[PDB]
Design an enzyme around this catalytic site. Structure first.
Site, PDB file in Angstrom:
ATOM      1  N   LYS B  39       4.414   0.186 -30.004  1.00 16.90           N
ATOM      2  CA  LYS B  39       5.092   1.297 -30.650  1.00 16.90           C
ATOM      3  C   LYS B  39       4.490   1.839 -31.996  1.00 16.90           C
ATOM      4  CE  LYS B  39       7.574  -2.439 -33.124  1.00 16.90           C
ATOM      5  NZ  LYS B  39       8.056  -3.713 -32.619  1.00 16.90           N
ATOM      6  N   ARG B 139      20.184  -7.355 -34.974  1.00 13.11           N
ATOM      7  CA  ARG B 139      19.774  -5.947 -34.952  1.00 13.11           C
ATOM      8  C   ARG B 139      20.412  -5.249 -33.727  1.00 13.11           C
ATOM      9  NH1 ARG B 139      13.363  -4.854 -35.202  1.00 13.11           N
ATOM     10  NH2 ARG B 139      13.544  -6.112 -33.272  1.00 13.11           N
ATOM     11  N   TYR B 272      -3.884  12.673 -62.655  1.00 10.48           N
ATOM     12  CA  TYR B 272      -2.584  12.960 -63.261  1.00 10.48           C
ATOM     13  C   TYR B 272      -2.173  11.915 -64.335  1.00 10.48           C
ATOM     14  CZ  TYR B 272      -1.732  16.504 -59.634  1.00 10.48           C
ATOM     15  OH  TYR B 272      -1.782  17.638 -58.870  1.00 10.48           O
ATOM     16  N   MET B 320      -2.193  13.278 -53.991  1.00 12.87           N
ATOM     17  CA  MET B 320      -1.625  13.424 -52.654  1.00 12.87           C
ATOM     18  C   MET B 320      -2.715  13.336 -51.571  1.00 12.87           C
ATOM     19  SD  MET B 320       0.800  16.329 -50.938  1.00 12.87           S
ATOM     20  CE  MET B 320       2.042  16.095 -52.262  1.00 12.87           C
TER      21      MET B 320
END
Ligand code: PLP
Ligand code: PLP
Ligand code: CL
Ligand code: CL
Ligand code: MG
Ligand code: MG
Ligand code: MG
EC number: 5.1.1.1
Lengths: 386, 386
Positions: B39, B139, B272, B320
């Protein structure tokens, strides 16, 4: 109502995006254009629908991180100018010209080699180029007046290239001490006046990010680059607390409860490591979000979600695709109930800023790391689509 | 060589994946099958190509997080059993049956309602079901043997459903204290024994994850669920230290230097916040990876990458889409040089486990949060493809 197999989704409110654009438009000088920054998949909001809405309600150009991000927008039918903010390899000069994508460059050699590629080709259009001036961010861009002039001369001498902008980037415009920002601005102006003294006419000048557009609207020049603010998020608490522009958060992250149970029998251990033990009467709700969705594992035993207007805690560790939360001893709750992971529910709210504080990071990271396997739905004129 | 506009990429070595599957196959009982867990986009590696390779070299079945993930694999031409490990809404029963996707369930009402939907739609296919028994993970799953017996009866009376497995999940099988794991095992076997005394014939039983497969191969029963180990990563330091199986990490993350500069002129602030100030003869290299790629902002002034066989530090804040690293005073490096962000280079290595340690998380999160905007290349028989 939404029908999903795995019941976790994002809602992006485009009415909020419209208001955010309008609030910034109303604040900066009337002559100034807005370039909407939709890099990193629209800061995780979905680049295409946010770009489309922005170009309809105040923005005239777009910015992205890569040629590939620009091509995605072109394939969706967006025809507005698109600027790539980072470095583009010369292997993509031909492609960027075909797709009418504007590239950033700042080096004589790059201008000359890119021009040479296009020369060799049946190239019926010039490639648009913005020059990046590095005034203190230290990331990309040319750093001296003398080298800037050589780059500009190379670009102008390159007949298959077209100069359409010049920019710099502020590294601390969201901070209370404005000293470095004022020095960056002064340096940028000085380089530009140096070019003008050489007889050079300037293309589109842009320098402001969201922070400087808000705190220094007088720096907006021909165009600003609206990023975080477009999504209704402030670049820093300091900028938010200036109270100059009212922004509305566009994104919420939601799920539906997958299973609810009372922990009647032993072991009452919850999730990996058994780091949490439930009471016999405690209700545990399982939710289909996990750290592979971008829900940080560091929210294990720390995070909160909203259920029926109230904050309920993450219980035990965050797993890859699921989390468990405690509705308390009884914690009224049913399979299928809607929960809000980021956002508002009744009077209650868990903002992306609060999540970022908890994780010692910034709202930018929280939204831009939301996985592409979460489907995004869009709200426009109060109705939902896509 | 590789041609990208934005020069950041992943390499997944399928030879290593083959060797990892072979090491688990050789460790567990000959009769036990292997379910490859792909997955979350193959733990960020890419589900399709990892699944295809696993099925060629030892695995019999696949597991995913959602129906949508299983459908991606069918569309790739895969015909092997595919189990959805989490909760699937009844809204997708029709669809799951049509694509031959196996769903996990564990409640009477869900079984009965799923059967009714398929009846009403005159479904040309029966839906395969595994039952989840919750023995301590807390779960999903049924928690008492009496409850379990009612779920089995409901499933068996449902002619449009087909029982093909029953399973549980270990919450602490990767830890030195084995007490919990032995209690889960015992409880699971007791529930299964309860069914048999009722005369019920059991389908395929599975309980082991990577950890239990290595530390408790005798629990392998009919099938194990190989996740993290497939990718050449251990579930914990403790399991690795047991030195029972040799795994080779399959994923590396690389880039090319976008720009190199000497910080001769002021200001010498980088990124930054201006959190880093370079020396006048210090060389700074800019790289096209950032936190929206999944390269954590918490590596700001902390992380390392490999350049020319040596560790070089992140300078200033991660942005980013980009980071800066220091090549030191008069350091040698040129635009276009290959850098390794996660993996090996010459004598050196920055492993995903070391990054996970830096960040106080686990290798599972580091690889499964790698953004899909990074392209993946695959190595097989020593040569690349996509
Ligand atoms: C990301 C980015 C922007 C947008 O910044 P916000 O702070 O989000 O408004 C502007 N300019 C550059 C150069 C960027 O990289
Ligand atoms: C993801 C997962 C696995 C694979 O576990 P690893 O620790 O990666 O081997 C096994 N079982 C279940 C129930 C899972 O969700
Ligand atoms: Cl920059
Ligand atoms: Cl589970
Ligand atoms: Mg992604
Ligand atoms: Mg052996
Ligand atoms: Mg992360």
């Amino acid at each position: 109502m939404i029908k999903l197999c795995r019941e976790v989704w994002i809602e992006v409110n485009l009415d909020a995006v419209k208001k955010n654009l309008r609030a910034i438009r109303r604040h900066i000088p009337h002559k100034s254009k807005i370039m909407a920054v939709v890099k990193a998949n629209g800061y995780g909001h979905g680049s295409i629908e946010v770009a489309r809405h922005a170009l309809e309600h105040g923005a005239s150009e777009l910015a992205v991180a890569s040629v590939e991000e620009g091509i995605v927008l072109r394939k969706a039918g967006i025809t507005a100018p698109i600027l790539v903010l980072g470095f583009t390899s010369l292997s993509c000069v031909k492609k960027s010209a075909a797709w009418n994508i504007t590239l950033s460059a700042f080096q004589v050699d790059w201008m000359k080699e890119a021009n040479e590629i296009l020369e060799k080709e049946a190239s019926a259009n010039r490639l648009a180029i913005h020059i990046n001036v590095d005034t203190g961010m230290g990331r990309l861009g040319v750093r001296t007046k003398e080298e800037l002039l050589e780059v500009v001369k190379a670009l102008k001498a390159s007949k298959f290239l077209r100069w359409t902008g010049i920019f710099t980037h502020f590294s601390t415009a969201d901070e209370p001490d404005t000293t470095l920002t004022k020095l960056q601005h002064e340096k940028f102006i000085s380089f530009l006046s140096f070019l003008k003294k050489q007889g050079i006419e300037l293309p589109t000048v842009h320098m402001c990010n969201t922070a400087a557009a808000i705190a220094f609207p007088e720096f907006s020049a021909d165009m600003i680059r609206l990023g975080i603010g477009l999504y209704g998020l402030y670049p820093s608490a300091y900028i938010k607390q200036l109270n100059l522009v009212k922004l509305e958060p566009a994104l919420s992250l939601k799920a539906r409860i997958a299973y609810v149970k009372t922990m009647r029998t032993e072991p009452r251990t919850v999730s990996y490591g058994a780091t949490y033990i439930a009471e016999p009467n405690e209700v545990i709700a399982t939710l289909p979000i996990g750290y592979a969705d971008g829900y940080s594992r560091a929210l294990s035993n720390r995070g909160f979600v909203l259920h029926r207007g109230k904050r309920v805690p993450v219980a035990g560790r965050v797993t890859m695709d699921m989390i468990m939360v405690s509705l308390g001893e009884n914690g009224e709750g049913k399979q299928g109930d809607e929960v809000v992971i980021y956002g508002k529910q009744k009077g209650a709210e868990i903002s992306v800023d609060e999540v970022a504080e908890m994780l010692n990071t910034i709202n930018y990271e929280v939204v831009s790391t939301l996985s592409r396997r979460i489907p995004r739905f869009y709200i426009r004129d109060g109705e939902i689509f896509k």
